[PDB]
Amino acid sequence: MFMINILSLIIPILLAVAFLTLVERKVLGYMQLRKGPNVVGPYGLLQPIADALKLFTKEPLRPATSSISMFIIAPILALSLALTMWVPLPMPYPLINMNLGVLFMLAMSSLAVYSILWSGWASNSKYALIGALRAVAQTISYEVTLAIILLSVLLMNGSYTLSTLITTQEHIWMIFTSWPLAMMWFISTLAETNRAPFDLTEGESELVSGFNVEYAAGPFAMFFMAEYANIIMMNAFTAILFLGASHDPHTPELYTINFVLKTLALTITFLWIRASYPRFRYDQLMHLLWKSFLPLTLALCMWHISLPIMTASIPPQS
Amino acid sequence: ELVQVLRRGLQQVSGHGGLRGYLRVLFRANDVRVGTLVGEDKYGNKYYEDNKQFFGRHRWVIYTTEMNGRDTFWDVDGSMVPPEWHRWLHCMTDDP
Amino acid sequence: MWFEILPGIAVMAACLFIPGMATAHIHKFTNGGKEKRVAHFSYQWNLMERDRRISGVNRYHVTKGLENID
Amino acid sequence: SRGEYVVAKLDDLVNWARRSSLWPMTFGLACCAVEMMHMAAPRYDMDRFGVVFRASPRQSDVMIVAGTLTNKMAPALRKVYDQMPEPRYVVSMGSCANGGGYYHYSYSVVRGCDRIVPVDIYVPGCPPTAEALLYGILQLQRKIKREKRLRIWYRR
Amino acid sequence: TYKFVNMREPSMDMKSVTDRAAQTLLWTELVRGLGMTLSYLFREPATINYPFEKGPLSPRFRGEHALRRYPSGEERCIACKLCEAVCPAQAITIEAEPRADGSRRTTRYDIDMTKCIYCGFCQEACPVDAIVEGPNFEFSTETHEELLYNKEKLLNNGDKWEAEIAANIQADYLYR
Amino acid sequence: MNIMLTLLTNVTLASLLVLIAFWLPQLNAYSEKTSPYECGFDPMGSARLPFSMKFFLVAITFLLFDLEIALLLPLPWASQTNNLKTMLTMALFLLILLAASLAYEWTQKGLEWAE
Amino acid sequence: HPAAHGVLRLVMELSGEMVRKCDPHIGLLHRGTEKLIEYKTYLQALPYFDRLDYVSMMCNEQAYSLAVEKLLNIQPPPRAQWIRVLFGEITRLLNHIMAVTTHALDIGAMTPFFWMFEEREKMFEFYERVSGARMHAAYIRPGGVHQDLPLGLLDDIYEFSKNFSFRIDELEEMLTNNRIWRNRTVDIGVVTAEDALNYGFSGVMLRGSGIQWDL
Amino acid sequence: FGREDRFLNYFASMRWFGGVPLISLGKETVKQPVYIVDVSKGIINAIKDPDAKGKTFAFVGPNRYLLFDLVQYIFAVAYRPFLPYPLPHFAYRWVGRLFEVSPFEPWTTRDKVERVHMSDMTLPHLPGLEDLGIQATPLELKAIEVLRRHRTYRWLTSEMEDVKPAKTVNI
Ligand SMILES: CCCCCCCCCCCCCCCCC[C@@H](O)O[C@H](CO[C@H](O)CCCCCCCCCCCCCCC)COP(=O)(O)OCC[N+](C)(C)C
Ligand SMILES: CCCCCCCCCCCCCCCCC[C@@H](O)O[C@H](CO[C@H](O)CCCCCCCCCCCCCCC)COP(=O)(O)OCC[N+](C)(C)C
Ligand SMILES: CCCCCCCC/C=C\CCCCCCCC(=O)O[C@H](COC(=O)CCCCCCC/C=C/CCCCCCCC)COP(=O)(O)OCCN
Ligand SMILES: CCCCCCCCCCC1=C(C)C(=O)C(OC)=C(OC)C1=O
Ligand code: SF4
Ligand code: SF4
Ligand code: SF4
């Protein structure tokens, strides 16, 4: 019965991811005064299926200079980690209930970048190497600020348990108490998913395809679905963190609907942001994260340590 | 004004000869608008006009399902338009 | 159209509806229909083990009321 | 027979998937490529047909040769055609690509790209209009729809 | 006369300084760009439904070539070879001889469509309106050889497109 | 037990996807197809040559700043102590030293990349 | 490469991502136009200039026509000259739209390209209505223009022109005051006036450095 | 033998099973392989030659190799570890029959196992490539253009004159 729940988690996520690509294409088309896919199926509803079938009936190639073991390992790790990131999310009940969910997601996200690094290195190409180095720089840019933002926001929750966030926001969304950090947090998620204006590891206009330039067919498809699943997962985590939905124990479907709507809104906001802005330079992202986000994050960490003690509002469950 | 647009959608559904014609035109042209019929080919292509649309969408053709020797229910192309309706359809003239 | 973007989004929503809902229903199906017990600390696990021991069927969720004190 | 029916249905499925997802390489040479830009522009919106530009040859399905192929450029075009995974297709667009065109008698021009790579569709024009190139793409889609790989394998 | 594009200074009063600090910290111009894209989202797209709808053309449009006839059915071409002489791409090849009735007619009239630059100089040079560039543009082939037209192919194109060609010439000939 | 099973399921699905990708389609691999890609041409040198890193100092500083996270994450539990004054003083002291280290590296041109 | 315009082979020596040397390799689109012109008559040689700079067609036509008219010692009629200047400005609009939008595309702003290429399509309609070709018009010839404007063309040009300003405004909204665009473009590729003069620059490449020159 | 052959590529791909199975260790088989371009040029010259109407030609290479030495040279050019072991004829026939059940192109067949382990016939009474004006190309000049595809990244740039031409049993 637990395998049934695992499958009921993973398969709809993949289906959602496939449809996300269609949604992303149509939203960008309509913001660019065009339509996007509307031919393959009504309203383009069959486009993701055709894309997947095309990609998995296409010949995958092994570069002659490539390191085969890491070349095959990297997409597997990417997809498996993208699926694993979803298990502690409470909607409103998690598949895996952990005392430290936030730290688990932090560690898994930290491990996820090695798929990019190892694929870029094992491709044994120059553009792939440049993309891998850009991934290294991006992680160095955002990691510390993201972690300190999480700590400061969770200081008002009382623990690292994700489901407790539902209890913390029984009456008001956490954004109303931490909208500065939230803003910074949002940008960090953009940097964590390698999304515009921080899509540097791919860098189509500069690096052709970046780290995955040597990948084709199924491994490339797996990298794609891993990226989109990470997008949806990070937006879901943000929705749980900062937009608390009201949960009624005898009717969890209301929480499920509210959570899904908020996650969809945040993902559509990501698509909008991609449609609106140019691309950063990968040293400018480092300077942004280390000279603007880090000082404010440190000051707000001090503030959010001091505030519960000042107001006698320390949360329970040591 | 939401009810107005929903009623317009229902009108588009009903004006294609029912639900079956609506689905036929939707899966044959990815378009479900209704326009004033201008004429028909000897090969079976129908030509519709709607002057309220913007330039480019104000004239269109529903292709036949059977030209000279092949079945064109799904496989249609712009080379199936005869020269007179080709001149009309490409806005080289304002006269059908 | 712009509303032609809505269908795909709808499909997306449907998919995202399934996991959480599924979990909830499964949690009710394998825990007596009463919201699977949470054991974050040792005390709650001890309570669960005592319930399993005294249920008589090796299942913690089979709850015995005052009808069991003769 | 049952096997003939099954392989025909599988051929239909694979052909539909391959022709409904056509990803040309980001590859253009001259004036013709400009019209290619107008084929992706909102008026024609090739993305609505499932046609997406992708820069990497490893992630591309179609090569559209839009422009004059010179002798200095021929090895590069052949190289990036060979690095395309199969099944792959080539669309020759414009006069220069088709047979040399205005520079046919030059000392530095390849008299047609079919001397370097096999060609599936030839789109005439100098340059062909965006509608003409879209017609060529749809013709290539029909040609893919006519493929019978699994039937041929079964009858072997 | 000239103007400067980047020669403006910002005011240093507390109002403007606080406004600029608020712009830096709360990202107002980025929200303006988001609003612009959102405004474009709700507009009607400019896409047409090809092949069921077509982009507009003109009577002067230069498409596929055709050889024309007089209303009696006689060919207009007299093998003068002006189009061959004027062709910038040397796409036209012509051979001629007296016909069985002594008429000046072509025996070979080929146009290499893969050499053609579609400039329309041939129909400008023609004195009898024999060769024209028709309205057709959807004639892509699957082999190179199918784009090497001979006299029969061009005469068939004329016979097939004459109804539209005559109308376009009627609409355009007063400018020529 | 449940987490191990979940990890095994995810890894198995990814591996099966790779197997399908590599065993279903028709492969025609020759030398020119599998060569490295440099947009039209054979690369001059190897991709295993040294690649200079201009942000190496920031990379070293990231190692020291990452352990501040290790020192700071127990704060939600530390806030539940009786002597809140000492805990608040120590947390503020640690954050002040982190900010001072950042300021020192900033003022000495340590955040600027090599030229 | 998406940013190499198709036929540029830039051999770059990099130290990390710092550019130590740029070595442009060109000739991947060398078709030998100048040698081919020597076998054509002047009218036959005219359409090569359409294909020289295929983003600004009538401007090259006009330059070649002016050179041939100067050598012929003849003068075009006034209406031909006015039509030439009008379509040259239309061509300038086309060229600047393409330049700015592809520049933004290379930087990463992909949306204004689609907004402005509809206007480019409308100007292509103007070209086709005047000559029968969307881009390679061959309209401007030594001595004037090939054909007169069809009736109703000026009204449609006026209709386009009375609305193009808002498209320029929307592009400027999306790019000009954005801090990311400024971070990507400010103080990048700085060239001095003396270096620009000695290196043979012209047009905006001069006027960006304060040089007050325009032909 | 050539780029798209099933002769050099066959032995090179047999590296995927760890050890190389050879009947009688390949010590009782002699091979005389011929280049693909040589065969095609011979066909063309036979078309253009007027005396070759009703003749029968034998197209063979300039050298004869014991199968063991040939396979060892093939593995040496591919820079792959050579691990030959003897397999009984019935066992190798059973392996070929096992591989024969593939609905796709078989990896090997019983007929292939038979044909690999037969010595090439000698027919000196028949005209050869030299009668059509062709000098047969030795295997040691063209083996790299087929076997360089089977190398790892570490040995891709190794030259042709690096790999010690194999010993030939030439009469
Ligand atoms: C279950 C997980 C493993 C399998 C994964 C696959 C999941 C199912 C795949 C879904 C298939 C749907 C595709 C069908 C869409 C076709 C729609 C229709 O248009 O097709 C027409 C005809 O249909 C096609 O000929 C056949 C397509 C379907 C093939 C038969 C179904 C086979 C299903 C077998 C499933 C087995 C999966 C593997 C099991 C292990 C051709 O029209 P077309 O020319 O394009 O359109 C012209 C464009 N116009 C209109 C704008 C002018
Ligand atoms: C969506 C997630 C879940 C998916 C669930 C399904 C997972 C499927 C995994 C992927 C396999 C499907 C892809 C291809 C079909 C299987 C055939 C192939 O994989 O193996 C063949 C197996 O053939 C072997 O080489 C030898 C055949 C026999 C092997 C001996 C084993 C014992 C058989 C003895 C006969 C008695 C019957 C035994 C069965 C009971 C080798 O084919 P090969 O040509 O290389 O590669 C080209 C593949 N093409 C042709 C489709 C393009
Ligand atoms: C009484 C005591 C109370 C305690 C004090 C509380 C008051 C706090 C007031 C200040 C809060 C400021 C929060 C903002 C944090 C960072 C903002 C910032 O200053 O960074 C910008 C940069 O920020 C950006 O420009 C972002 C770039 C990427 C933009 C990506 C898309 C834009 C976001 C779209 C909407 C965001 C939605 C956020 C919420 C999502 C829902 C969770 C500075 O960069 P530069 O202009 O280059 O100048 C640096 C040199 N001086
Ligand atoms: C996504 C927006 C559409 C992009 C179309 C990509 C076309 C690829 C051709 C390459 C090319 C580019 C990029 C280009 O910018 C250009 O103008 C100088 C060319 O000359 C016509 C080109 O050939
Ligand atoms: S065919 Fe004409 S438009 Fe196309 S590249 Fe050649 S000269 Fe330019
Ligand atoms: S249109 Fe121009 S290039 Fe084509 S045949 Fe006529 S004169 Fe020659
Ligand atoms: S088509 Fe006209 S110009 Fe050409 S040979 Fe015939 S009559 Fe003369």
PDB file of C-alpha atoms in Angstrom, chain E:
ATOM      1  CA  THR E   1      20.967  69.801 -35.519  1.00  0.00           C
ATOM      2  CA  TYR E   2      21.424  67.122 -32.864  1.00  0.00           C
ATOM      3  CA  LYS E   3      20.228  65.962 -29.459  1.00  0.00           C
ATOM      4  CA  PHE E   4      21.787  64.175 -26.491  1.00  0.00           C
ATOM      5  CA  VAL E   5      20.502  60.748 -25.493  1.00  0.00           C
ATOM      6  CA  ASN E   6      22.263  60.281 -22.140  1.00  0.00           C
ATOM      7  CA  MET E   7      23.043  63.738 -20.755  1.00  0.00           C
ATOM      8  CA  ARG E   8      20.553  64.117 -17.889  1.00  0.00           C
ATOM      9  CA  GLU E   9      21.433  64.464 -14.181  1.00  0.00           C
ATOM     10  CA  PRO E  10      19.335  63.323 -11.200  1.00  0.00           C
ATOM     11  CA  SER E  11      18.084  65.743  -8.571  1.00  0.00           C
ATOM     12  CA  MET E  12      19.730  65.301  -5.169  1.00  0.00           C
ATOM     13  CA  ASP E  13      16.856  66.405  -2.929  1.00  0.00           C
ATOM     14  CA  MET E  14      15.591  64.091  -0.201  1.00  0.00           C
ATOM     15  CA  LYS E  15      12.397  63.409  -2.168  1.00  0.00           C
ATOM     16  CA  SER E  16      14.264  62.095  -5.212  1.00  0.00           C
ATOM     17  CA  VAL E  17      16.898  60.274  -3.145  1.00  0.00           C
ATOM     18  CA  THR E  18      14.210  58.469  -1.143  1.00  0.00           C
ATOM     19  CA  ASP E  19      12.326  57.662  -4.355  1.00  0.00           C
ATOM     20  CA  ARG E  20      15.481  56.174  -5.882  1.00  0.00           C
ATOM     21  CA  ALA E  21      16.178  54.154  -2.727  1.00  0.00           C
ATOM     22  CA  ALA E  22      12.611  52.823  -2.820  1.00  0.00           C
ATOM     23  CA  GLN E  23      13.119  51.963  -6.496  1.00  0.00           C
ATOM     24  CA  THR E  24      16.291  50.053  -5.614  1.00  0.00           C
ATOM     25  CA  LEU E  25      14.793  48.173  -2.663  1.00  0.00           C
ATOM     26  CA  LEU E  26      11.277  47.396  -3.963  1.00  0.00           C
ATOM     27  CA  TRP E  27      11.965  46.899  -7.713  1.00  0.00           C
ATOM     28  CA  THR E  28       9.396  49.228  -9.245  1.00  0.00           C
ATOM     29  CA  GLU E  29      10.690  49.279 -12.840  1.00  0.00           C
ATOM     30  CA  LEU E  30      10.894  45.480 -12.873  1.00  0.00           C
ATOM     31  CA  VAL E  31       7.218  45.466 -11.889  1.00  0.00           C
ATOM     32  CA  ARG E  32       6.617  47.916 -14.752  1.00  0.00           C
ATOM     33  CA  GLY E  33       8.169  45.439 -17.183  1.00  0.00           C
ATOM     34  CA  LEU E  34       6.059  42.644 -15.719  1.00  0.00           C
ATOM     35  CA  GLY E  35       2.998  44.834 -16.223  1.00  0.00           C
ATOM     36  CA  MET E  36       3.949  45.421 -19.852  1.00  0.00           C
ATOM     37  CA  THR E  37       4.213  41.686 -20.535  1.00  0.00           C
ATOM     38  CA  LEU E  38       0.947  41.087 -18.662  1.00  0.00           C
ATOM     39  CA  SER E  39      -0.718  43.742 -20.818  1.00  0.00           C
ATOM     40  CA  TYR E  40       0.515  41.922 -23.916  1.00  0.00           C
ATOM     41  CA  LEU E  41      -0.863  38.656 -22.501  1.00  0.00           C
ATOM     42  CA  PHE E  42      -4.498  39.800 -22.746  1.00  0.00           C
ATOM     43  CA  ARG E  43      -4.197  41.226 -26.266  1.00  0.00           C
ATOM     44  CA  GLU E  44      -5.423  39.345 -29.317  1.00  0.00           C
ATOM     45  CA  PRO E  45      -2.554  37.429 -30.970  1.00  0.00           C
ATOM     46  CA  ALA E  46      -1.459  38.278 -34.503  1.00  0.00           C
ATOM     47  CA  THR E  47      -1.195  34.648 -35.648  1.00  0.00           C
ATOM     48  CA  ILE E  48      -3.195  33.546 -38.679  1.00  0.00           C
ATOM     49  CA  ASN E  49      -4.512  30.019 -39.227  1.00  0.00           C
ATOM     50  CA  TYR E  50      -2.347  28.791 -42.070  1.00  0.00           C
ATOM     51  CA  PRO E  51      -3.034  26.964 -44.373  1.00  0.00           C
ATOM     52  CA  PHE E  52      -6.708  27.860 -43.886  1.00  0.00           C
ATOM     53  CA  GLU E  53      -5.805  31.566 -43.857  1.00  0.00           C
ATOM     54  CA  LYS E  54      -3.164  33.234 -46.008  1.00  0.00           C
ATOM     55  CA  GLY E  55      -1.055  36.357 -45.805  1.00  0.00           C
ATOM     56  CA  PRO E  56      -2.024  39.135 -48.201  1.00  0.00           C
ATOM     57  CA  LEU E  57      -0.285  39.508 -51.556  1.00  0.00           C
ATOM     58  CA  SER E  58      -0.336  41.982 -54.440  1.00  0.00           C
ATOM     59  CA  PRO E  59      -0.898  41.828 -58.215  1.00  0.00           C
ATOM     60  CA  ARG E  60       2.833  42.580 -58.595  1.00  0.00           C
ATOM     61  CA  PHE E  61       3.867  39.480 -56.612  1.00  0.00           C
ATOM     62  CA  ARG E  62       6.618  37.458 -58.306  1.00  0.00           C
ATOM     63  CA  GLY E  63       6.041  33.728 -57.900  1.00  0.00           C
ATOM     64  CA  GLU E  64       6.269  30.669 -60.131  1.00  0.00           C
ATOM     65  CA  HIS E  65       6.967  31.234 -63.821  1.00  0.00           C
ATOM     66  CA  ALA E  66       4.496  30.602 -66.628  1.00  0.00           C
ATOM     67  CA  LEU E  67       4.337  30.796 -70.424  1.00  0.00           C
ATOM     68  CA  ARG E  68       1.186  32.404 -71.798  1.00  0.00           C
ATOM     69  CA  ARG E  69      -1.000  32.219 -74.901  1.00  0.00           C
ATOM     70  CA  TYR E  70      -3.075  34.453 -77.118  1.00  0.00           C
ATOM     71  CA  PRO E  71      -6.869  33.999 -76.863  1.00  0.00           C
ATOM     72  CA  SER E  72      -6.718  31.786 -79.974  1.00  0.00           C
ATOM     73  CA  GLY E  73      -4.422  29.313 -78.186  1.00  0.00           C
ATOM     74  CA  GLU E  74      -1.264  30.361 -80.029  1.00  0.00           C
ATOM     75  CA  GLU E  75       1.853  30.804 -77.913  1.00  0.00           C
ATOM     76  CA  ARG E  76       2.902  34.391 -77.257  1.00  0.00           C
ATOM     77  CA  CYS E  77       6.608  33.502 -77.218  1.00  0.00           C
ATOM     78  CA  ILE E  78       8.451  34.396 -80.431  1.00  0.00           C
ATOM     79  CA  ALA E  79      11.934  33.177 -79.401  1.00  0.00           C
ATOM     80  CA  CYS E  80      13.408  36.684 -79.391  1.00  0.00           C
ATOM     81  CA  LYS E  81      15.653  35.653 -76.445  1.00  0.00           C
ATOM     82  CA  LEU E  82      15.377  38.962 -74.579  1.00  0.00           C
ATOM     83  CA  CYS E  83      14.598  37.196 -71.298  1.00  0.00           C
ATOM     84  CA  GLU E  84      17.624  34.941 -71.776  1.00  0.00           C
ATOM     85  CA  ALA E  85      19.868  37.945 -72.436  1.00  0.00           C
ATOM     86  CA  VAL E  86      18.579  39.918 -69.445  1.00  0.00           C
ATOM     87  CA  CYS E  87      18.547  37.066 -66.876  1.00  0.00           C
ATOM     88  CA  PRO E  88      21.026  38.001 -64.114  1.00  0.00           C
ATOM     89  CA  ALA E  89      21.430  34.334 -63.125  1.00  0.00           C
ATOM     90  CA  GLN E  90      21.542  32.736 -66.610  1.00  0.00           C
ATOM     91  CA  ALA E  91      18.564  30.605 -65.593  1.00  0.00           C
ATOM     92  CA  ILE E  92      16.916  30.644 -69.049  1.00  0.00           C
ATOM     93  CA  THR E  93      18.026  28.407 -71.932  1.00  0.00           C
ATOM     94  CA  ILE E  94      16.357  28.837 -75.333  1.00  0.00           C
ATOM     95  CA  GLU E  95      16.612  27.096 -78.701  1.00  0.00           C
ATOM     96  CA  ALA E  96      14.418  27.950 -81.671  1.00  0.00           C
ATOM     97  CA  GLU E  97      13.719  27.171 -85.321  1.00  0.00           C
ATOM     98  CA  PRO E  98      10.991  27.818 -87.911  1.00  0.00           C
ATOM     99  CA  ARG E  99       7.849  25.816 -87.228  1.00  0.00           C
ATOM    100  CA  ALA E 100       6.168  23.612 -89.827  1.00  0.00           C
ATOM    101  CA  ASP E 101       4.107  26.651 -90.871  1.00  0.00           C
ATOM    102  CA  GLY E 102       7.140  28.959 -90.862  1.00  0.00           C
ATOM    103  CA  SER E 103       6.442  30.599 -87.500  1.00  0.00           C
ATOM    104  CA  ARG E 104       9.191  31.805 -85.154  1.00  0.00           C
ATOM    105  CA  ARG E 105       8.736  29.514 -82.148  1.00  0.00           C
ATOM    106  CA  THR E 106      10.941  27.958 -79.488  1.00  0.00           C
ATOM    107  CA  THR E 107      11.971  24.317 -79.464  1.00  0.00           C
ATOM    108  CA  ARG E 108      13.671  24.483 -76.052  1.00  0.00           C
ATOM    109  CA  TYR E 109      12.684  26.857 -73.244  1.00  0.00           C
ATOM    110  CA  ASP E 110      14.114  25.797 -69.877  1.00  0.00           C
ATOM    111  CA  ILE E 111      14.241  27.787 -66.647  1.00  0.00           C
ATOM    112  CA  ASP E 112      16.499  26.454 -63.889  1.00  0.00           C
ATOM    113  CA  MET E 113      14.446  27.316 -60.801  1.00  0.00           C
ATOM    114  CA  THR E 114      17.468  26.588 -58.587  1.00  0.00           C
ATOM    115  CA  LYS E 115      19.418  29.232 -60.514  1.00  0.00           C
ATOM    116  CA  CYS E 116      16.534  31.726 -60.624  1.00  0.00           C
ATOM    117  CA  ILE E 117      16.679  34.719 -58.283  1.00  0.00           C
ATOM    118  CA  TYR E 118      12.999  35.579 -58.923  1.00  0.00           C
ATOM    119  CA  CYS E 119      13.735  39.184 -59.879  1.00  0.00           C
ATOM    120  CA  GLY E 120      11.056  39.598 -62.556  1.00  0.00           C
ATOM    121  CA  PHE E 121      13.483  41.029 -65.117  1.00  0.00           C
ATOM    122  CA  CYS E 122      12.368  38.448 -67.689  1.00  0.00           C
ATOM    123  CA  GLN E 123       8.760  39.655 -67.773  1.00  0.00           C
ATOM    124  CA  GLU E 124      10.004  43.248 -67.945  1.00  0.00           C
ATOM    125  CA  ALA E 125      12.146  42.349 -70.965  1.00  0.00           C
ATOM    126  CA  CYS E 126       9.431  40.352 -72.743  1.00  0.00           C
ATOM    127  CA  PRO E 127       7.763  42.446 -75.489  1.00  0.00           C
ATOM    128  CA  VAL E 128       4.723  40.186 -75.988  1.00  0.00           C
ATOM    129  CA  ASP E 129       3.908  39.268 -72.366  1.00  0.00           C
ATOM    130  CA  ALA E 130       4.865  35.640 -73.022  1.00  0.00           C
ATOM    131  CA  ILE E 131       6.796  34.766 -69.840  1.00  0.00           C
ATOM    132  CA  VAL E 132       5.432  35.932 -66.482  1.00  0.00           C
ATOM    133  CA  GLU E 133       5.998  35.294 -62.795  1.00  0.00           C
ATOM    134  CA  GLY E 134       2.718  33.919 -61.529  1.00  0.00           C
ATOM    135  CA  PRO E 135       0.985  34.210 -58.176  1.00  0.00           C
ATOM    136  CA  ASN E 136       1.938  30.711 -57.003  1.00  0.00           C
ATOM    137  CA  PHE E 137       4.544  30.166 -54.292  1.00  0.00           C
ATOM    138  CA  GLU E 138       3.616  26.704 -52.931  1.00  0.00           C
ATOM    139  CA  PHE E 139       5.550  24.460 -55.316  1.00  0.00           C
ATOM    140  CA  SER E 140       8.183  22.793 -53.137  1.00  0.00           C
ATOM    141  CA  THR E 141       9.480  19.465 -54.436  1.00  0.00           C
ATOM    142  CA  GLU E 142      11.160  16.371 -53.018  1.00  0.00           C
ATOM    143  CA  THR E 143      13.938  16.081 -55.622  1.00  0.00           C
ATOM    144  CA  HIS E 144      16.219  18.662 -57.199  1.00  0.00           C
ATOM    145  CA  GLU E 145      15.372  17.477 -60.719  1.00  0.00           C
ATOM    146  CA  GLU E 146      11.711  18.495 -60.334  1.00  0.00           C
ATOM    147  CA  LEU E 147      12.808  22.159 -60.197  1.00  0.00           C
ATOM    148  CA  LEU E 148      14.368  22.130 -63.697  1.00  0.00           C
ATOM    149  CA  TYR E 149      11.453  23.331 -65.814  1.00  0.00           C
ATOM    150  CA  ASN E 150      11.226  22.751 -69.558  1.00  0.00           C
ATOM    151  CA  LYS E 151       8.845  24.267 -72.111  1.00  0.00           C
ATOM    152  CA  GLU E 152       6.078  21.732 -71.428  1.00  0.00           C
ATOM    153  CA  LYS E 153       6.107  22.408 -67.679  1.00  0.00           C
ATOM    154  CA  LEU E 154       5.964  26.188 -68.136  1.00  0.00           C
ATOM    155  CA  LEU E 155       3.196  25.915 -70.733  1.00  0.00           C
ATOM    156  CA  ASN E 156       1.250  23.711 -68.310  1.00  0.00           C
ATOM    157  CA  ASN E 157       1.776  26.309 -65.575  1.00  0.00           C
ATOM    158  CA  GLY E 158       0.408  28.975 -67.905  1.00  0.00           C
ATOM    159  CA  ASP E 159      -2.585  26.852 -68.899  1.00  0.00           C
ATOM    160  CA  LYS E 160      -3.283  26.167 -65.225  1.00  0.00           C
ATOM    161  CA  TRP E 161      -2.823  29.699 -63.836  1.00  0.00           C
ATOM    162  CA  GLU E 162      -4.003  31.853 -66.771  1.00  0.00           C
ATOM    163  CA  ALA E 163      -7.282  32.802 -65.078  1.00  0.00           C
ATOM    164  CA  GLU E 164      -5.434  34.472 -62.192  1.00  0.00           C
ATOM    165  CA  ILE E 165      -2.508  35.695 -64.317  1.00  0.00           C
ATOM    166  CA  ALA E 166      -4.739  37.604 -66.742  1.00  0.00           C
ATOM    167  CA  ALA E 167      -6.578  39.266 -63.856  1.00  0.00           C
ATOM    168  CA  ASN E 168      -3.324  40.321 -62.176  1.00  0.00           C
ATOM    169  CA  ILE E 169      -1.970  41.708 -65.454  1.00  0.00           C
ATOM    170  CA  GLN E 170      -5.259  43.554 -66.000  1.00  0.00           C
ATOM    171  CA  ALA E 171      -4.916  45.065 -62.523  1.00  0.00           C
ATOM    172  CA  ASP E 172      -1.234  46.010 -62.918  1.00  0.00           C
ATOM    173  CA  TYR E 173      -0.475  46.805 -66.576  1.00  0.00           C
ATOM    174  CA  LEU E 174      -1.241  50.536 -66.320  1.00  0.00           C
ATOM    175  CA  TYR E 175       1.778  50.999 -64.030  1.00  0.00           C
ATOM    176  CA  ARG E 176       4.159  49.299 -66.480  1.00  0.00           C
TER     177      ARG E 176
END
